Design a protein around this nucleic acid. Structure first.
Lengths: 161, 143, 188, 261
RNA sequence: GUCGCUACUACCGAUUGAAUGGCUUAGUGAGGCCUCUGGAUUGGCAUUGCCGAG
RNA sequence: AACCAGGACUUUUACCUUGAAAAAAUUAGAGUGUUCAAAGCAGGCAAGUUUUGCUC
RNA sequence: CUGGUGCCAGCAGCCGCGGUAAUUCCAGCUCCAAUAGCGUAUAUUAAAGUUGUUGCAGUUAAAAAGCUCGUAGUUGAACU
RNA sequence: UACCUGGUUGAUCCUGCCAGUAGUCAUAUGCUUGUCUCAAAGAUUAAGCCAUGCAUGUCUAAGUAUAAGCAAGUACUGUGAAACUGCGAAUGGCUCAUUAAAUCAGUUAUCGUUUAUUUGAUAGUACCUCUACUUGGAUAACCGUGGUAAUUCUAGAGCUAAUACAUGCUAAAAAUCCCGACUUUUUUGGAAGGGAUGUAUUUAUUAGAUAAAAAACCAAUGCCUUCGGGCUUUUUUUGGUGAGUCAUAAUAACUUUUCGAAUCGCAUGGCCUUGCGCCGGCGAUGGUUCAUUCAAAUUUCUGCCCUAUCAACUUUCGAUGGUAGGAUAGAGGCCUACCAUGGUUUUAACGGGUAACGGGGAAUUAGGGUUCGAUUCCGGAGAGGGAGCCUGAGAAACGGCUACCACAUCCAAGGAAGGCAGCAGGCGCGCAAAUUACCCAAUCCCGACACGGGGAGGUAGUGACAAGAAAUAA
């Protein structure tokens, strides 16, 4: 039975658990199920204890303190890459991408370095359709005014005769 | 049956969405024509009652079927029972039999309704459980 | 849930209709929303068809109108005076349709003073000219003067808070005011 | 129950579709659109069963995705689109400009017309009211609405909308001597000239129409359709002109056909 | 027509009659729902009261 | 005053006639070479050209 | 028709056959009806004018209340 | 397809029933058998119980690529596992348990209601008296790693994306109403400059004249003539329905303020301060409102088997009606408080039985009638019996969930987990009824969509029978 942050009962209990809280995965939309879970406090019935390091002590454990993992993935969005590389406003953001090596990829000669894609960068393709949408709006306004003027002539003639 | 003071209830019996101001004295009364060739009775135009569930000076509308029957019971409040009589067909014996069905219609204070006194009723949307008709035209024996 | 069919109801001839269908979702009902006086408490219920209904359990700063001048303003609802049908509903202080309430008239006094100028119950050339042009209709009912002196006014709500989430009404005046005052004179 | 239906069985399908009883179990089940499912022809039925421009349900879908059926001047891709009365089908890859009109017997038939007269689509109006910003709007029988219409048009009238360029260019009234076709009923698909309009309280106007041979018949106001006045039908009529060719004369026509070969 | 023997049919019957299902009486009451509460936790604000939520 | 033309016109039904709108299948039944038939709703032209058609 | 039993076995939708001459029991021969189909058991329909409005019957075959009053119900002279 | 015969008697004529006679996808069984076409096959009792496999999935160039693969231009540029997202899952198919004005059938109303998708219209208005116009964070997969004997077993740990979620100027200009700096009649004295004034909710009020045609007074005040005071074709809003408080426009306020685009794919067109700046097309996906369509929900009239050894029934705890309120998408005793005693019935009310789903329809056929109709089409109900609920426009859904009741199952004994009156197959009841087959090719349905799926559906295996043609001769 997994953890449950919030239940103060000092033993496992069953509740109509919802997907909003953890320890669930909906099979379909609008699904709720009855499941058992342990309390938020610790007793003697536990077998595995999950802990986090706050501050290292005087000595260093050879197996964990010495070993460290690298961050193999970098930023993707324009804001993310800007905050990651601390580049200026006009600094050729496209030149701050992370490049990987494909030697294990059995590339043979000229290892083709592969880099991820950058999002939320200004590209003139979106502006074209935005201008077209504004174009459609002004065309709708001009057509509305033209047919309004035509009906104004019709109504003026009708009230005259 | 018997018409009493219109403001004889917990709530002030009033025609909805009608107002009196200083410029327009007193309270104007609104009337409508039900249609289908009927005419609005004069005392409905100038009366006292409100009768929210009335084809005149009210909110209900006349649409659907129009029936004719004789009112049997008037002991109940603002509604009556209409008795419709008809002859049924038996193909086997080539003869008729007398069949009757009792209706349930609403009567406004505009119409004085007693026993006998066959009337004409029309569909006026469900009103109370089994009341779906309202009296529109009365062919009274007195007149 | 609660049902609204006539199948469970006894027939007009006295016979009891046997069970025909299970309860359906196109005929469901819901609990009443007795919106008592308190800090604004409004939530949403998803009604059939994807629409939403604004409920109410406590309401403050409602809307009330004044038909003589055709002016409506937001006012703070104080308490409920009368409600037909069960009078215990008044004792439990619930707001529903067709229930007279007591309201304050401080915004009405401020607007009246800033519009007509001549104070009720006692330079600026353009203001004086406007007062002269709009003088003559400033007369008000004796009841409308007593309520301003006493600081409280009677109003009738013409909206259903349990359906639209608002308690909107109008200031009581005229023959309806006289009928309601004569109704509550022996009670208070 | 519990919601709408998506499957229409055969045999229960409309009779005028003339669908084969065998060779399948279900009917095309027209999708929602501008015409009622009971008074419309699916595009698949029109192209396959009524036109033979494709066999079985597959090739017809292929050409529909091919963007060739410019119905009302625009290409659609719904294999079961509810193509109703007075619809135009323009296959510009071939040049045909088919029209959808009732025949003498009251069934849809081939009404191929020229490039002209296939642009405007004659439509009956349903009601006239006032829209937003205090403007009048009109709604037709083919689910099309027109903004700022002619002020002289009332209900149960006729308009000729241009399509693509749109906007009402001409309207036709409802009075005596006007040529009238019956859209549905037991007098399906026969043009004549309205001579008498009989008024009934509540609803159900009764229209008495005299055909070309002066045989006379009656129909309902909801089922009449005004096209032209005193022999000035602005739209073309199909073969037979919709008179009322009876069985006793169709037998003679068949006998004459036999006595030709 | 009474008395017969038999296969078999039906009735009454002490056993304060037994054995299923609807209709109701009285008692209690799972379950989801609406509503009144409760703020581990997320917390922007050495600090410290305020927008907040499941 | 009075007259003509159009509309409404049964005090009130039962009864009879016609029309409207009206699901298909199914029943009767029209047409039509599944070798006949139970069938099905198609089908046909047309031997001397093979015509990238017509006809119902 | 020929052989076996002899109110026994049995046959048999009903009448009905069988106690030593059994055209009706079981064996053989042949014939009759339908046909790749026939019989049996049950439900139903026509005949059933034995449900009868069309279209039953009531003195003796089943059937007129012992008799009378009387409300529903049914039927109701002629004349515009 | 208007039909008879044998049987009471010694013999006769009747009444009278029995029997023979003929028909019936109307059922079973017995005897028999060489062929084809066409159509049905667990309904009759056990709407009894099920091992097993399947029946609901879906992607275009165009919602997310870092494949944590692949065959072969320094943001990526071709394929793409994997997942989130949107939609369907409320359609099909099975059965007839319940149901007696109930369902259903024909015929009306919704001026008493809701609606995903489709079609047609609809949007120079969002914020300041210093506002991003391009913007926040989380969220999968990958990644080490853990408990339970197995789980649709997950959290613990690092993150990165959205047409998901949450914020956020866009577009001018003209005009309108309010706050008011100011003078000098230069009207009844209005405007410098400041703000709201798009769209959507609720409340109150006004106009909503219009079958046509003349005058006596009062108020603010629009054109002001020629200041006597006039005052108009019209600015008085307008149109429609058998019928409205209908649609629309004006006035005064409210909205835990709805919508008004932070998205993708191809044509590299034209310009001069030459910035690599301005501008220009073809599509696609969302979103407000209305109408329409597909549906749903109520609802008017008429028509239902047997039973009097059921004659009175219904009002407590709603039975009949009025007022007010609540709830519902909506009318309505659907519910609540009060007030009246009412409603049906010998024209059979009510109760009971039905081996009763209803109808189109089927069998017999002078006519009239009698019987049947689970079943290929329509409508209703159910998914073991009830009850409740989320999602979704649409379910009181069961190949969605939850609890009880009766069953079955793995258990390590801590627990877990279901529903074939769907397609096949098994047990039992049985006189009584078939393969644990192939395929989406035809009909159609679903989805992001030529491309995928569909035990719906098509095809076949099995038989004595349901109809049509005919070997055993010459």
């Amino acid at each position: 039975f997994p953890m449950f942050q919030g239940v103060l009962l000092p033993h496992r209990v069953r509740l109509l658990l919802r997907a909003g809280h953890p320890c669930y995965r909906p099979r379909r939309d609008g699904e709720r199920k009855r499941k058992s879970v342990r309390g938020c406090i610790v007793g003697q019935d536990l077998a595995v204890l999950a802990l986090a390091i706050v501050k290292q002590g005087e000595q260093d454990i050879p197996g964990l303190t010495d070993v460290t993992v690298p961050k193999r993935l970098g930023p993707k969005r324009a804001s993310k890459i800007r905050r990651f590389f601390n580049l200026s406003k006009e600094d050729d953001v496209r030149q701050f991408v992370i490049r990987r090596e494909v030697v294990p990829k059995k590339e043979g000669k000229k290892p083709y370095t592969k880099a991820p894609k950058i999002q939320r960068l200004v590209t003139p393709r979106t502006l074209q359709h935005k201008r077209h949408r504004f174009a459609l709006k002004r065309r709708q306004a001009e057509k509305n005014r033209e047919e309004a003027a035509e009906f104004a002539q019709l109504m003026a003639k009708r009230v005259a005769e | 049956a018997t018409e009493l003071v219109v403001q004889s209830e917990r709530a002030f019996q009033k025609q909805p969405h009608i107002f009196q101001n200083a410029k327009k004295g007193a309270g104007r009364r609104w009337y409508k024509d039900v249609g289908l060739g009927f005419k609005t009775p004069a005392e409905a135009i100038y009366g006292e009652y409100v009768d929210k569930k009335c084809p005149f000076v009210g909110q209900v509308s006349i649409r659907g079927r129009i029936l004719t029957g004789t009112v049997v019971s008037t002991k109940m409040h603002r509604t009556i029972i209409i008795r419709r009589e008809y002859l049924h067909f038996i193909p086997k014996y080539n003869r008729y039999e007398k069949r009757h069905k009792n209706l349930a219609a609403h009567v406004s204070p505009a119409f004085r309704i007693n026993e006998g006194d066959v009337v004409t009723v029309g569909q006026c949307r469900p009103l109370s459980k089994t009341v779906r008709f309202n009296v529109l035209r009365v062919v009274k024996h007195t007149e | 849930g609660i049902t609204r069919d006539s199948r469970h109801k006894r027939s007009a001839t006295g016979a009891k209709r046997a069970q025909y269908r299970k309860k359906r979702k196109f005929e469901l009902g819901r609990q009443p929303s007795n919106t008592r006086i308190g800090p604004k408490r409004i939530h949403e219920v998803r009604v059939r068809g994807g629409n939403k209904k604004f409920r109410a359990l406590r309401l403050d700063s409602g809307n009330f109108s004044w038909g003589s001048e055709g002016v409506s303003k937001k006012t703070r609802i104080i308490q409920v005076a009368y409600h037909p049908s069960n009078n215990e509903l008044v004792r439990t202080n619930t707001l529903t349709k067709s229930a007279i309430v007591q309201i304050d008239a401080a915004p009405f006094r401020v607007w009246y003073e800033t519009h007509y100028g001549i104070l009720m119950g006692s330079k600026s050339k353009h203001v004086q000219r406007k007062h002269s042009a709009r003088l003559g209709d400033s007369k008000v009912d004796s009841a409308l003067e007593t309520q301003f002196a006493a600081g409280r006014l009677y109003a009738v709500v013409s909206s259903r808070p349990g359906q639209s989430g608002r308690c909107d009404g109008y200031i009581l005046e005229g023959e309806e005011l006289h009928f309601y005052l004569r109704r509550m004179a022996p009670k208070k | 129950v519990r919601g709408p239906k998506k499957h229409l069985k055969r045999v229960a399908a409309p009779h005028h579709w003339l669908l084969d009883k065998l060779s399948g179990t279900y009917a095309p089940k027209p999708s929602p659109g501008p015409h009622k499912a009971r008074e419309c022809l699916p595009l698949i039925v029109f192209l396959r069963n009524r036109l033979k421009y494709a066999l079985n349900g597959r090739e017809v879908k292929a050409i529909l995705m091919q963007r060739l059926i410019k119905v009302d001047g625009k290409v659609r891709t719904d294999s079961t689109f509810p193509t109703g009365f007075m619809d135009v089908i323009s296959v510009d890859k071939t040049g045909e400009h088919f029209r959808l009109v009732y025949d003498i017997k009251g069934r849809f038939t081939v009404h191929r017309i020229t490039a002209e007269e296939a642009k405007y689509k004659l439509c009956k109006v349903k009601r006239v009211q006032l829209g937003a910003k205090g403007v009048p709007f009109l709604v037709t029988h083919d689910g099309r609405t027109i903004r700022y219409p002619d002020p002289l048009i009332k209900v149960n009238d006729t308009i000729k909308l241009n399509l693509e360029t749109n906007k009402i260019e001409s309207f036709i009234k409802f009075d005596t001597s006007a040529q009238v076709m019956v859209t549905g009923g037991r007098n399906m698909g026969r043009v004549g000239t309205i001579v008498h309009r009989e008024h009934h309280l509540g609803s159900f106007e009764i229209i008495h129409v005299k055909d070309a041979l002066d045989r006379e018949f009656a129909t309902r106001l909801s089922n009449v359709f005004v096209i032209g006045e005193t022999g000035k039908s602005w739209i073309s009529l199909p073969k037979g002109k919709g008179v009322k060719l009876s069985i006793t004369e169709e037998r003679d026509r068949r006998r004459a056909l036999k006595g030709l070969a």
